[PDB]
């Protein structure tokens, strides 16, 4: 039995502190977030059907104080509805605080707050790129395994008002009907290839015609006509995805038929990129707020 309000209050009370200040929840509280959110994820569709207005965010990668700023400008739940597109953990310094706040809001406002799976919500990846280390350092191995079982139940994609298709990575040459996504059973790991892999790993590329081998070493690239055909077959207007660092936080592809969102400013302290959040209003007019890193 969670005291979700107590947990959220403690996560938010570090706002305004010198960036880097930790929240040390109890191990049992973090475990509780995982157990309860897993129930909620499994009870909801794996392909979400969402109604605007809402705000959509891309990668966070453990940049907790940047997540707090997103909420400060976007409005704290449930003032605004949110959809996050994955990659909550790794690389940044506070993956635990980040995923704990997101899971806590999912539990408190399960029909106003939504989280998709990214490719870093996968044990084979986040064992290496920082999350496992953070868990072992601050708590224990067992807690990391608990997060893994929770992540294995995240939904994979969302459609906003039957017009905006959202996922972390991108399209799949295997994908012909949305029913294929719906029939993916959870819990599941992410396979090294195939539909689920592509949805979390693939990228648009302006120089490819059709499908190409992705330079990442996983999945594919796809071109602008693949996007156009996808939108026409499924009666969609827009693909909204994340997964790539883009300099202004958002970046259009294929004459605004696809948009990439990335919400971790100055990623890894290397890229000097902005982070963006896309607001979708009830008429599906999309607008962008960006957080630009300054000295």
């Amino acid at each position: 039995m969670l005291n979700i309000d107590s947990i959220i209050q403690r996560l938010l009370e570090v706002r305004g502190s010198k960036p880097g200040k930790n929240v040390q929840l109890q191990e049992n509280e973090i475990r509780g977030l995982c157990l309860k959110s897993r129930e909620i994820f499994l009870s909801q569709p794996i392909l979400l059907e969402l109604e605007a207005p809402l705000k959509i965010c891309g990668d966070i990668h453990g940049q907790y104080y940047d997540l707090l700023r997103l909420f400060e400008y976007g409005g704290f739940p449930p003032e605004s509805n949110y959809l996050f597109l994955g990659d909550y953990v790794d690389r940044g310094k506070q993956s635990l605080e980040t995923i704990c706040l997101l899971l806590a809001y999912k539990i408190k406002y399960p029909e106003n707050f939504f989280l998709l799976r990214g490719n870093h919500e996968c044990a084979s990846i986040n064992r290496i790129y920082g999350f496992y280390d953070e868990c072992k350092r601050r708590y224990n191995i067992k807690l990391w395994k608990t997060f893994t079982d929770c992540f294995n139940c995240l939904p994979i994609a969302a459609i906003v008002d039957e017009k905006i298709f959202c996922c972390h990575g991108g399209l799949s040459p295997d994908l012909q009907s949305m029913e294929q996504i719906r029939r993916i059973m959870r819990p599941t790991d992410v396979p090294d290839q195939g539909l689920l892999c592509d949805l979390l790993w693939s990228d648009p590329d302006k120089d490819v015609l059709g499908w190409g081998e992705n330079d990442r070493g996983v999945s594919f690239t796809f071109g602008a006509e693949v996007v156009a055909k996808f939108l026409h077959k499924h009666d969609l207007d827009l693909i909204c995805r994340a997964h790539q660092v883009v300099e202004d936080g958002y970046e259009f592809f294929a004459k605004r038929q696809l948009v990439t969102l990335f919400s971790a400013p100055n990623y890894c302290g290397e890229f000097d990129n902005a982070g963006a959040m896309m607001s979708v209003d009830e008429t599906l007019m999309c607008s962008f707020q960006i957080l630009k890193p300054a000295e």
């Binding site: 008002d161 999309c286 607008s287 962008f288 300054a294």
Partner: peptide, 16 residues
């Protein structure tokens, strides 16, 4: 409905 886009982008700076 139909997706449209606002031309005006809102920018915030994050010092530090």
């Amino acid at each position: 409905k139909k997706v449209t886009f606002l031309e005006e982008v809102t920018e915030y700076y994050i010092s530090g």
